[PDB]
Symmetry: C4
């Protein structure tokens, strides 16, 4: 378990992306402005509350000493910046109750803390996770291709739909059905909606790939590294659901313009893993806090240049698609 | 004859592909699964029988000492893995009855063995081939451009249609009209169907090119190396025929995902030559058997990720096309 | 102020363009000609007068010693060639009345001289600018993204629309609403038109980028370097306005064919900054005059090859679009 | 005059093409053949006669010692192979009656000889050309952009239409209106047709460019090197005229497949300059004759692979377009 956690960190950081669907989106700007920078509002709503900011640190780690170190650093960045921080899968702490790598709330009482568990875990373990972590939301992840590429992975999936119904019926905090970089498909969103799920994380291809990661671990099956749908394609494919389900978007988000692009297409908020992980591995925590504060300023200036005074206003922004996104749209 | 056989092997392995149409197909996956890996069924039907697996070793060699060696190795892989193995053209053994390079059945009694002859050969030779080889099916190949690029090649083709009618009327095993990498066109499929042919191998461009090979042998006419239609284009062009004729697909199949892509478009099974030839030239036979067993596991996991419990289910999978395939579809 | 002016010159010249939308436009020529070269007329009309030529030197500099040097050289080229020369923003001279870097008219009495001020400056400063410079027109620039990327930049924009109304009502020379390389959007043109603006400079992306420049100065935010719409995209997006507002076009104009392409789409005239700046930095003033004279000859020969005897005739020329421009047109 | 002729040869051979529109055309082949190679007929009709073969050596040279050498070699290739050979512009021999570089008929009595003159020359000179050369046809070339890029070039074109009417009315051999690599436009074809012209050479962009050549000579104006329409685009744009005017096609023809592609779109015959010039500069005349004989064999084999027994049959061949040709077709 501990070695897998550290290999995930290692190989995620090693990965080099060669395609990012955000680069196939162009926004039509506004030459003549309407607003002052100081009036631009960054707030959004999802999972039963209003949030000051429209981006969050997405599920990564916990379950090893390196995970403990990373989680402490992420918790400090998140608390200081007033943003949501979701830990990696809590399963490691269920198997080893001595594990203190997820225990960041005690020292960070103002932290907005979410946590994460796999849909393969029975609802009893989800309940235990929520009871132990007291999170603001629970991500319930779906990672079929990752499990199948792992020698130690799950092989039976018949129970997952029944599990999802159980989580929806029993978990006392908001649940977010959570992809892991393969891009959540519309049929899955429909099924989740039917079970009562009202928030999803589309987490698509373009950034971290767990096919790449598990294939580095196994040394096999590289031909599957580009499995799934890109982040923008998953978001475009989900448009019919954008007002019935809260769409959180992640996967290859590098910068505030990528965030804005998600919001233009009706995302409620935008998650980052690799970008933030790399920052914490490269700079001091104080420096990372400065960068994240800078992201807020960048969001406001981009919105100002788009004549948008609120996050909701972004959905009115006109755009052009190119390349693969455009070719795919021709077929939809 | 023997030198041509060995040059075919040499130049086929030397060839480097720069375009593969499978890379212009994207499958829409399923984040929320339905099935257990152990319930995924790989069986298919064509040429009058049910097959345990949906891929086969396609026609290559025989007629030289190297061909004998390769055929023994392929027969061992095929028998061990329970898959169809089709020999190269049997004409060499008709011309030289001493040739034992095709005689793999005697030592491999559980082998599913097919064989191959050119449509230029009169039906009497086809009958002799079937009588001598006792195959489960007979591929009857069409290779006009290859013949024309060969100094020793055929120059008269008026008789080929009459030959095809003869084979259809007289051969007592199922016949498969077989392309050799130029991509079987729809008009040919229609004509074949009219004669009573019910199974074809579309074998398109993207993998081994016999224009490339014969042009290496002759040192001339490289400008024809990309003759014909790509494997995916031939398959898409054949869609109107997919339920009146059994479409077998080959040409540039590298891995199990390429196989799955063929099946998504209604192929009954998928043939491999170069990929398997390279494996047998690189690894021990035992190692190749392991790789092929691994392909079965990979097919099941890809199907699981696509929520497909049977081969037939794959035809329901949604997709996106890009690049040349997309541009061509715009014109169809 | 002086250091910013010189950094603008430095970084503008350092910039290397990797995309130019003019290269995605193809003109259908005429094999059989109609006209003599000596009868081709280059005249155009905008901002209340007829001009002998359809290109001009666009706003750049003034406000430093290097700016004084450059402005003297540009004034000599412009006067000798009978073309419009627009200075950079005059704000530096408003803040420092000792500044003589814009004072080129006194030595060049036949110069067609325009000047420039930011829309952030109250109309009283615009009036002072016009009174001091006696220009043939006043460009009023909009540069929101540039201001936001500058540490010393504007942060309040609520007043800009009211300013534009004031300038339209009060300035006694023609005004041109002026982009700075981000590509003026159609909604801005509509708003400007409503206020009484009748001439705009679309100045789009493809040549000098002030995102690139300010980001070089700050060392941050390179992910915004390609902000805005390309020159051709802005021109195509403005087609509904081409006969209600005079469209001047600039941004990445390299040569006379780029000029012709703008005119084919109904521009009244074409502005150049970087190309002319680089010429004056590379060659003697006498040599630059020769090159600019050569541009006139080139315009005539291109028009002759297109069977166009006047600038207006160019709007009848047929064309093909490719790449991004074509993909964007598919979406409009 | 002599130095210009030799510079044309030099720079034409130096040129490297980076785009060839023939590479954006794919032909749908026939897997099941109908015909014998020995029954495939290569004959065609244009300019008042039947021709044994559908390709010709297009206008190049004459007017210098090197031109005399090249013309003797081309005449020997053409006579031996039974194909049309068109000399370069005869104007040099009109200005210098001592010039013997075009005098190839006397030694080659079975030669099919055409000649060439510019439309700028009055009909009296065209008549003198035909009287002196006794050609089977007269190409009358249009090269406006080339003339304009030449320091010694024509500057007055008002007379060209009247000249064309004169040539049509007076010249006693068939006339071919002849482009020089810029791609003859449909409006020109219409005008020519109205004057009585019934054969044109579309000579488009993709091979030799006289913009490139004249710009190498002058050292200026490289930005015009890609002027005009590609060979395939000119041919596609001319489709409405293909049965009212005989379309000869040239420009970047490299090999027999390029020839076939022209014929698929209704060309009567296909011209080659650079390819044949390079052959004569690289190989012995005997070797070039072998290569050209080989082209005939290649045409037959390609036709056989397309189930075409005659040149006319090629117009029934199905195709796919890609890239720029496809994008342009989307706009037509
Ligand atoms: C090191 C590491 C570890 C994990 C992850 C990522 C990384 C980088 N991810 C997946 C993550 O939340 C996200 O879906 C993808 O990484 C895509 O986003 P980025 O491109 O990395 O921003 C993840 N997802 C999840 O739901 N539970 C988890 O425990 C983990 N573990
Ligand atoms: C060495 C070798 C030899 C042969 C072949 C191939 C190779 C590699 N192929 C063609 C083969 O069955 C298939 O159509 C193509 O090779 C395309 O598939 P791959 O891209 O190689 O998988 C072949 N086809 C056939 O019908 N009869 C034959 O005798 C042969 N001979
Ligand atoms: C050195 C320098 C300085 C300035 C500029 C440019 C350059 C190169 N530009 C912007 C200019 O007018 C034009 O909009 C862009 O440069 C795009 O055109 P080019 O691609 O450079 O031809 C400019 N624009 C403006 O309205 N007022 C100004 O003061 C300046 N300053
Ligand atoms: C050395 C040389 C000289 C000439 C030419 C070409 C070359 C290579 N070309 C143009 C020629 O006929 C043809 O239109 C173009 O060269 C395009 O065809 P290729 O791409 O070269 O096959 C030519 N055309 C013409 O009508 N009269 C001429 O005198 C000449 N001169």
């Amino acid at each position: 378990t501990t070695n897998r956690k550290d290999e995930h960190i290692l190989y995620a950081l090693e990965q080099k992306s060669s395609y990012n669907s955000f680069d196939e989106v162009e926004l039509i700007h506004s030459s003549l402005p309407l607003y002052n920078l100081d009036e631009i509002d960054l707030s959004t709503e999802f999972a039963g509350r209003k949030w000051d900011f429209p981006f969050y640190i997405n599920a990564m780690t916990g379950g090893s000493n390196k995970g403990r170190e990373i989680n402490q650093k992420l918790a400090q960045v998140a608390e200081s910046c007033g943003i949501l921080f979701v830990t990696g899968s809590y399963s490691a702490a269920l198997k080893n109750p001595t594990d203190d790598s997820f225990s960041v709330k005690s020292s960070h009482p103002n932290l907005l803390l979410g946590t994460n568990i796999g849909l393969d875990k029975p609802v009893e373990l989800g309940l235990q996770t929520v009871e132990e972590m007291n999170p603001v939301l629970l991500q319930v992840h779906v990672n079929v291709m990752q499990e199948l590429l792992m020698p130690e992975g799950e092989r039976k999936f018949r129970s997952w739909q029944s599990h999802l119904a159980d989580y929806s019926k029993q978990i006392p905090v908001p649940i977010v059905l959570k992809e892991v970089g393969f891009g959540m498909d519309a049929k899955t969103i429909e099924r989740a909606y039917e079970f009562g799920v009202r928030t999803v994380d589309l987490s698509g291809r373009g950034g971290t790939s767990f096919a790449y990661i598990e294939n580095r671990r196994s040394g096999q099956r590289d031909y599957l590294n580009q499995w799934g749908q890109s982040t923008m394609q998953a978001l475009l494919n989900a448009q019919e659901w954008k007002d019935k389900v809260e769409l959180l978007v992640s996967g290859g988000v590098r910068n505030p313009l990528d965030m804005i692009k998600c919001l233009v297409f009706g995302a409620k908020a935008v998650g980052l893993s690799r970008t933030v992980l790399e920052l914490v591995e490269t700079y001091t925590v104080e420096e990372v806090i400065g960068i994240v504060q800078g992201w807020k300023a960048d969001l406001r200036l981009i919105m100002c240049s788009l004549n948008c005074a609120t996050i909701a206003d972004l959905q009115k922004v006109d755009y052009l698609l190119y390349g693969k996104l455009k070719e795919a749209k021709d077929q939809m």
